[PDB]
Amino acid sequence: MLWHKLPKSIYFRRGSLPIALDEVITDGHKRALIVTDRFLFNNGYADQITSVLKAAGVETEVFFEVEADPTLSIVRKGAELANSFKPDVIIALGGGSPMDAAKIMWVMYEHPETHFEELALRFMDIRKRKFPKMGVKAKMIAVTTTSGTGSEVTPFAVVTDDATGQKYPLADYALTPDMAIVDANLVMDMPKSLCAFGGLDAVTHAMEAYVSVLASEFSDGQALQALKLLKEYLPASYHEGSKNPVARERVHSAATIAGIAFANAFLGVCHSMAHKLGSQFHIPHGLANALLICNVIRYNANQARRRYAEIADHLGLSAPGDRTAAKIEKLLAWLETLKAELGIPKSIREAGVQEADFLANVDKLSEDAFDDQCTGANPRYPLISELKQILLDTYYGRDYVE
């Protein structure tokens, strides 16, 4: 049996934020905790939420100390703030890090009796087994400011234990936000690199969700629609920025639609390896995926290859009388051209990772990627040896070949 599980409400288009918040007000919420990071707090993004809520007599508090990774110490501090402030709605504001952090703060607030590493142990991934009851003390709203991680519609969160550096993925549909707000007025200032990295992150989400062993007829159409929107609007969004708000808005929705797909179909080894590259070498998550995705397609295309050919057909990249190999070659050629015009380097070496450093860690990276939660959904069951070959090829800029 399969499922399609999403927030009850996803509000989108420019200007949806104040209208969605009016529903929060009319639903009777009186105490709102905003969870965000320092850049977004400092640059007025939290004010866009708190001004509307305060005008209606809602009490507000802002926790702005989440950084680039959700850490256990920061999550505990935010949960302690919730315990004292007692919100009846938590509003995550930002990219993947604040939204993921807010999900775990929410659990700890709803269930102060539970120890995190308890939860970390039992709810590592989606399977049948129960998650503690959520949404009694507070509802969860996610407001995304990049285009994007899709975390505003997913059951996933990761937090790093400061003391050990160990990452703990959590996954349960009780962590899916109650409402997602996708308002492109919040992304018109994104710099080019963040536009590129978030957009290729979204491409990767939809690509991995489409060929995942858990792909379904309920996820497939959203995955393909996300890819079509990104093909058609991501270059203009990157090049033109705020001068083309429609392109910015289309990509903002596309990243959420990719989230809808992978929230239910999950991902694959491109994310498994991207996680390890990013954390070891401090490469942005979207850049790591951009560097790996074409070799992962080459790897999975040896059924995934039929599915990749369908994506090429959907994106208008195929010609009359192409058979599968030629269609996949055209899908890869489109991705390499997209990466190039978005300023993505051609190798991890050209991303700034330098040779002795990479060879010292490549075996640990391969082993850890194998153990990553996203590996189980990949259409090809990997050998550690093979993940190492992909990583090396991607380091030196070679196409993966068997």
Added chain:
Amino acid sequence: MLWHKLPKSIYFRRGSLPIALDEVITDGHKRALIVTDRFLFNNGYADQITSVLKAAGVETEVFFEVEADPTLSIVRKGAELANSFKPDVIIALGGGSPMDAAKIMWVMYEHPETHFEELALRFMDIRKRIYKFPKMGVKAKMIAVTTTSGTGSEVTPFAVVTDDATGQKYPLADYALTPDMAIVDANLVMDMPKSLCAFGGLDAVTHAMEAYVSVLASEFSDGQALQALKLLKEYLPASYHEGSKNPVARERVHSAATIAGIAFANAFLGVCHSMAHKLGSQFHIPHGLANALLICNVIRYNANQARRRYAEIADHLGLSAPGDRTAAKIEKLLAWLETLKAELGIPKSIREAGVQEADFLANVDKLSEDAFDDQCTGANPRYPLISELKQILLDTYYGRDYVE
């Protein structure tokens, strides 16, 4: 602002019903009211639910008196049973009639003080309102288990009920009526006769077709409308011809009808449903057959921006050729639909559907006016004249293609 609003949980594929019901049990529900019709009760469909729930110590009650249309007297009786039995979950089982009836029983149970009167008038459609729908989901959550493929009502905010005493129909629309969970288990549709398979499938085709060209279509509904159409193109003929011998085709079409529901729950429909409603109530034509008879002429009408969208559907379904322009792509979309109708045994005209000429001519003016006022008209990409709806109805009665 646009939206994408659905049940929190949709469970699907063969065998999904017992797994979905285990979440109902582990969520702590102890009293379940099943709402269905007599055919489904008598043929063991309700047993598939109650056996699982009772084995877990959930108390169950089954209301099986829903008729072919939700009627106000039956809805009131089901609400009174709810008032006495006090369920903490209502489980609708069936096609559109039980699922729509259950939504209204739910309202009356949550809010017995409210006058149905009132609700029917204030909440006829989705719009911006100072006054909000009464709070739902306090006494009970709502689960919808669909047994046709299908109306999509398991994911929509819509319900209609007929006043027996007057014959007046009351459409209701609010996202507080959207079920909390939809269950789409094709083990419940393997015995559907050919005609129910055909009518339900072309209803689903029509939902997805109208949702795609609606003025409220969005990037969040568009991909689901296209996926529904693709699944229906690829599996509805085999589902119809082969039935239970091809469970994958029955299962694909069952998901496709729900996926079409996702699209039109959010993007709404158009004048094909407007006119089909009026054919159905006046001449007692099944809903999916009425839509099947009209959709091709509604496309011809809307294609006079709708024509570009229809061409995109033809491209998506693999129906266009190299160097086709818009007009040719739409012609190929229409040719595919006509061939699908023919092989599903759909008649070529309303006349061959059993309505005779004198009765049709006597009511066609009222039908055209009533269809215009139908709430599905507002989403149609072409704002109609009553004059034009009348022409479509006459052309469809006599089996002519609509031409401008």
